[PDB]
Amino acid sequence: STAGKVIKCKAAVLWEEKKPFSIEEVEVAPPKAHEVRIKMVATGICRTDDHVVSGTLVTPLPVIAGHEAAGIVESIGEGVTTVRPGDKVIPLFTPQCGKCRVCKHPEGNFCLKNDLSMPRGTMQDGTSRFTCRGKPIHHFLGTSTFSQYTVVDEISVAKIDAASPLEKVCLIGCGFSTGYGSAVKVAKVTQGSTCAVFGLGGVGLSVIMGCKAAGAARIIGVDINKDKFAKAKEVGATECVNPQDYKKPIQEVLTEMSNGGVDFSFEVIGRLDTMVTALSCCQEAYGVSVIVGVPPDSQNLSMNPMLLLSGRTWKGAIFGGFKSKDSVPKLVADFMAKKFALDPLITHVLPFEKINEGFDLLRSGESIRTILTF
Amino acid sequence: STAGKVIKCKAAVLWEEKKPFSIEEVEVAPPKAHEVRIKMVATGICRTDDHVVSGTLVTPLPVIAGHEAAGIVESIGEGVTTVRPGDKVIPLFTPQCGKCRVCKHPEGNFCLKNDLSMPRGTMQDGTSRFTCRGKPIHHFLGTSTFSQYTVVDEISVAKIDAASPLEKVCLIGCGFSTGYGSAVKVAKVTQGSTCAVFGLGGVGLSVIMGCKAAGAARIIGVDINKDKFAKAKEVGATECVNPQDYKKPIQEVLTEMSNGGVDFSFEVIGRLDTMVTALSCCQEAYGVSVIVGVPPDSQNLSMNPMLLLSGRTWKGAIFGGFKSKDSVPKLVADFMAKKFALDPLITHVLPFEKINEGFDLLRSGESIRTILTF
Ligand SMILES: NC(=O)C1=CN([C@@H]2O[C@H](COP(=O)(O)OP(=O)(O)OC[C@H]3O[C@@H](n4cnc5c(N)ncnc54)[C@H](O)[C@@H]3O)[C@@H](O)[C@H]2O)C=CC1
Ligand SMILES: NC(=O)C1=CN([C@@H]2O[C@H](COP(=O)(O)OP(=O)(O)OC[C@H]3O[C@@H](n4cnc5c(N)ncnc54)[C@H](O)[C@@H]3O)[C@@H](O)[C@H]2O)C=CC1
Ligand SMILES: O=CNC1CCCCC1
Ligand SMILES: O=CNC1CCCCC1
Ligand SMILES: [Zn+2]
Ligand SMILES: [Zn+2]
Ligand SMILES: [Zn+2]
Ligand SMILES: [Zn+2]
């Protein structure tokens, strides 16, 4: 009854930076060739979406944000072969076109069709499927999940298990997979190692989950909000430290605690200074540091390259290094088989209409993941 | 005639920065417990030794520099078990104590007994074996090879094949092993890959040798001195580019040539700007960049962490990542078995007394490696 037709629905439109989202009616065009229109079931609030509001992450406005979500296919455009109406799906903020040099590389996952490096805020064809008050509205990372319906390119959606609980598995679309993969796939944490995790939000807790799964003997959580420590220990941290408690810089503290530096460190905040601190606290000859946090737009850090010359490895990754369309269904299957848990990340649940309250909870430090239900 | 006694011999003393080496008589104490006195045969002129003269690398002065060398054991102190009088040896500017956490780690080679991080310019016991004009003279990296005799700690010397040609294998003490290992062990260049090498001196040519040995399909040499290109092609470069020939920054040129970025890049110069350019020119999702060059003392580079967040890996290494005492004898044996060539690196051979002329050849751009003979 809606196939081929414009759908009018509610969405959370961001008209300008540093303002509440506006819950109001938008028009969602039907999918074109190789596009998929999705009815949203649940979406999480990730710090990246707040970065859009704050101007930390620059993408064209006005915009429908949201990128960590799950829903049910409402209709498919001409030529779609990988999903069907009625399928449960997770939108992929990093596409997997399967044809570019990165998709063909055994390690790479940052597909060249991404909308991150040179943000356009469009579908792959350079146009928008959203109208609001008669005005075109930008997409976000080819997902735009803060809406009752969205349209994504086929390379930006994965079919998942038909029995999946969408109010939980939406976290596999961003925060869980990012943190878990950063530990198990990017860093390749080893049994018996010592790890340090900077930032104990949804993504940092997922890093801890991955470090424990990889068998780390010590996992040191680092956060300036000590209210985050109890859940960090629940999911695997052996000891938590607040940098504000110490007179010395925390990388000196962590080097002392690890008897000369940690094996693996992770920056999961998004600050230039903590990226450098995290690199410095890994052991100078064989340590590995992974950047996960998003830096403020266009800003450069400063560092002494002797930190690298002694032997450190420094790297970063999007989405935990996972090839998105191959990996998301497998991660869902693994969740259904109880191989990892998502409940520890979910601290609050709200209806989509209370999106602004959900962002207030994030900004206040009270929440990890709030899940919004449509 | 000389065991247990002070040796008066010729050495090249550096009394202060930015002055020629002073060829004069020095006095070399006999070895104490666990020390080894070596009567040098050949020593190479490495850019690192020039960095001491120029103030790029800070180490206590006055000093006997030189660290890339080979000689013959004159005497051993109490407790030495790994070499004997008459053995051919190569001093190790990175020690291998075998006891610290780095030596025990499968990947690490930057032994915690090194004299680089906190330069003292002494023997392990904190004292000097050198006097000149009645003044104590500092050691350099526990080697000090610009002298007819030196004294090193046992952890800083390796015994090598009694039939080795010392006037060639001295290069295994630094330049060859550093460059070759940076490609084959640190970067782990893969066959069919595309590589970019910034700096075509002795170390950069050794990187090229390693990239070719690893089966790279394309090896792009980068140098502002085009006189370096002919030898780079002889040892495996498929193409050479001079940044000053182009209106665009060279990272953009290299990204275009490689159809979107190289697989492996190497900075083998020692400039902050080329360290960042080398990182930028590897492919953003799966590229690897290795810093080999020595940066100017205490200076920080500036970089955008988005270069790492997309997926790049940035690392550095001392001595090609080789565990020094284990690897040097094996590299000499490999040379004797004809597994790699050293002659392409040697452009000049001069008597030790012509040390200053040898440094003039390096500074003028004319030489690769000058070997000084005693
Ligand atoms: N690389 C990727 O693919 C992805 C990156 N991100 C980024 O990861 C970061 C974390 O995301 P979430 O976990 O949702 O964020 P979050 O805000 O829930 O967690 C961040 C934690 O860092 C702590 N923190 C803040 N400043 C600190 C400081 N100076 N020192 C120590 N701790 C400090 C906060 O108290 C907070 O608990 C964000 O920057 C986000 O944009 C998120 C998802 C995917
Ligand atoms: N990491 C380690 O273990 C080691 C590091 N090193 C360092 O490696 C570096 C290279 O050593 P060598 O080969 O002996 O030096 P070299 O001076 O013979 O070679 C350097 C090359 O860089 C080129 N160059 C200079 N500025 C340039 C620019 N802006 N762009 C492009 N090319 C430029 C020069 O023309 C020269 O050919 C030095 O900094 C040295 O201290 C050396 C040995 C061991
Ligand atoms: O949180 C999801 N996506 C992020 C990934 C890191 C760059 C900004 C967008
Ligand atoms: O060239 C020999 N040794 C160098 C290695 C890099 C740091 C300075 C000393
Ligand atoms: Zn996210
Ligand atoms: Zn692709
Ligand atoms: Zn050691
Ligand atoms: Zn050297």
CB atoms under 10 Å from CB of A95, counted, come to 27
> Mutual orientation of helices B47-54 and B355-363 as an angle, nearest 10°?
90
Distances (CA, A) of A49 to A21, A44, B180: 11, 10, 46
- CB contact B191 to A (< 8 Å): no
Hey, how many other C-beta atoms are within 10 angstroms of the C-beta on A218? 17
State the Cα–Cα distance between residues A364 and A227, nearest whole angstrom: 12
Q: Please, are residues B32 and B77 in contact by the beta-carbon 8 Å criterion?
A: yes
Which residue's structure tokens are 């070499």? Answer: B83
| Angstrom resolution of this structure | 1.4
Cα dist. A45→A9, A110, A263, A327 in Å? 20, 22, 31, 21
Smallest CA–CA distance from A267 into chain B, residue? B309
Read off the CATH number of the domain in which A258 is found.
3.40.50.720
B310 touches chain A (CB under 8 A): yes
CA-nearest of A5, A25, A33 to A353 is A25
Dihedral of the CA atoms B60, B63, B67, B73 (nearest 10)? -120
SS (H, E, C) B270-329: CCHHHHHHHHHHECCCCCEEEECCCCCCCCCEEECCHHHHCCCEEEECCHHHCCHHHHHH
Residues 6 or more apart whose CB falls under 8 angstroms from that of B364 comprise none
* Beta carbons of A110 and B285 less than 8 Å apart: yes
**Among candidate residues A58, A311, A360, the one with its CA nearest the CA of residue B116:** A311
Residues of B in contact with A101 (CB under 8 A): 259-260, 283
Contact yes or no for A214/A184 (Cβ under 8 A): yes
B229: Cβ contacts below 8 Å, ≥ 6 apart = B200, B221, B223, B237, B240, B242
Can you tell me the distance from the alpha carbon of B191 to that of B217, in angstroms, rounded to the nearest whole number? 7
List the structure tokens of B106.
Answer: 């499968």
Q: What CA–CA distances, in Å, run from B132 to A311, B11, B23?
A: 36, 9, 11
- Cross-chain residue pair A109–B303, CB shorter than 8 Å: no
Size of interface A-B (CB pairs under 8 A): 130
Residues of B in contact with A303 (CB under 8 A): 300-301, 303
Residue B122 is classified by DSSP as S
Torsion, CA A182, CA A184, CA A188, CA A191, rounded to 10: 130
**In this structure, which ligand is nearest to the CA of B112?**
7
| SS3 category, B205 | helix
Atom of ligand 4 nearest to the CA of B57: 8
Alpha helices in chain B (DSSP H): 47-54, 101-104, 166-169, 175-181, 202-213, 229-234, 250-257, 272-281, 306-309, 324-336, 355-363
Cβ pair A308:B318 closer than 8 A: no
Q: Both ends of chain A: CA-CA distance in Å?
A: 20
Nearest to B31 by CA among B70, B79, B68: B79
End-to-end CA distance of chain B: 20
Q: Please name every residue paired with B267 in a beta bridge, in sequence order, or none if there are none.
A: B198, B291
Mutate to test the interface with A, among B107, B309, B312, B324 (most CBs of A within 10 A): B309
Q: Are A111 and A155 in contact (CB under 8 A)?
A: yes
Upper half-sphere CA count for residue A228 (Cβ side, 13 Å): 27
Amino acid at B241: V
Asked whether the beta carbons of A193 and A217 are under 8 A apart, the reply is yes
Instruction: Test B321 with A309 for CB contact under 8 angstroms.
Output: no
Alpha carbon separation from A231 to A46, A47, A157, B64, B145 (Å, rounded): 18, 18, 31, 57, 57
Q: Domain span at residue A228?
A: 176-320
Give the Å distances, CA to CA, from B79 to A45, B34, B100, B122, B139. 66, 5, 20, 20, 22
B283, B285, B316 ranked by CB distance to A309: nearest: B316
Q: What are phi and psi of B127, to 5 degrees?
A: -125, 165
Residue A296 contacts B where some CB pair is shorter than 8 Å = no
Cross-chain CB nearest to A314 (options B107, B284, B314): B314
The SS3 of residue B19 is: coil
Of the candidates B216, B233, B317, the residue with the CA atom closest to the CA atom of residue B267: B317
Q: Quick one: angle between helices B250-257 and B272-281, nearest 10? A: 20
Going A197 to A199 to A203 to A208, the CA torsion angle's sign is positive
- Going by C-alpha positions, the residue among B317, B269, B266, B321 that lies closest to residue B288 is B266
Which of A107, A283, A314 lies at the smallest CB-CB distance from B315?
A314
Query: For a substitution probing ligand 2, which of B59, B116, B203, B224 has the most ligand atoms within 8 Å of its CB?
Result: B203
Centroid of ligand 2 to alpha carbon of B293 (angstroms): 6
Q: Which residues pair with B159 in a beta bridge?
A: B89
CA A331 to chain centre: 14
Q: What six digits make up the tokens of B186? A: 């640190």
B295-299, Cβ contacts within 8 angstroms, sequence gap of 24 or more: B295/A304, B295/A305, B295/A306, B295/A309, B295/B270, B295/B271, B296/B56, B296/B270, B296/B272, B297/B55, B297/B56, B297/B57, B297/B58, B298/A304, B298/B58, B299/A304, B299/B272
Per-residue burial over B102-128, b = 16 or more CB atoms within 10 Å of its CB, e = otherwise:
bbebeebbbbbbbbbeebebbbbeeeb
Place of tokens 């899940």: A371
The label of the residue with tokens 């066959």 reads B191
Give the pocket of ligand 4 (CB within 6 Å). Answer: B 46, 48, 57, 67, 93, 116, 174, 294, 318
Rounded to the nearest whole angstrom, what is the distance from the C-alpha of residue B5 to the centroid of ligand 5?
71
Cβ contacts of B101 on chain A, cutoff 8 Å: 259-260, 283
CB contact under 8 A, A308 and B316: yes
Q: Of all protein residues, whose CA lies closest to atom 9 belonging to ligand 3? A: A48
Ligand 2 and B268: CB distance under 6 A = yes
Token digits of residue A350: 């709200």
Residues of A in contact with B294 (CB under 8 A): 309
Mapped onto helix, strand or coil, the DSSP state of residue A370 is strand
- Rounded to an integer, what distance in angstroms lies between the CA atom of residue B56 and that of residue B261? 31
Using the mean position of ligand 2's atoms as its centre, give its distance from the Cα of residue B58 in Å.
17
Using DSSP's 3-state secondary structure scheme, residue B351 falls into: strand
**Nearest chain A CA: its distance from B315 CA (Å):** 4
Write the single-letter amino acid at B343. Answer: D
User: Helices in chain A by DSSP H: which ranges?
Assistant: 47-54, 101-104, 166-169, 175-181, 202-213, 229-234, 250-257, 272-281, 306-309, 324-336, 355-363
Q: Hey, is the C-beta of B295 within 8 angstroms of any chain A C-beta?
A: yes
Q: Please tell me the experimental approach by which this structure was elucidated.
A: X-ray
Atom of ligand 2 nearest to the CA of B200: 37
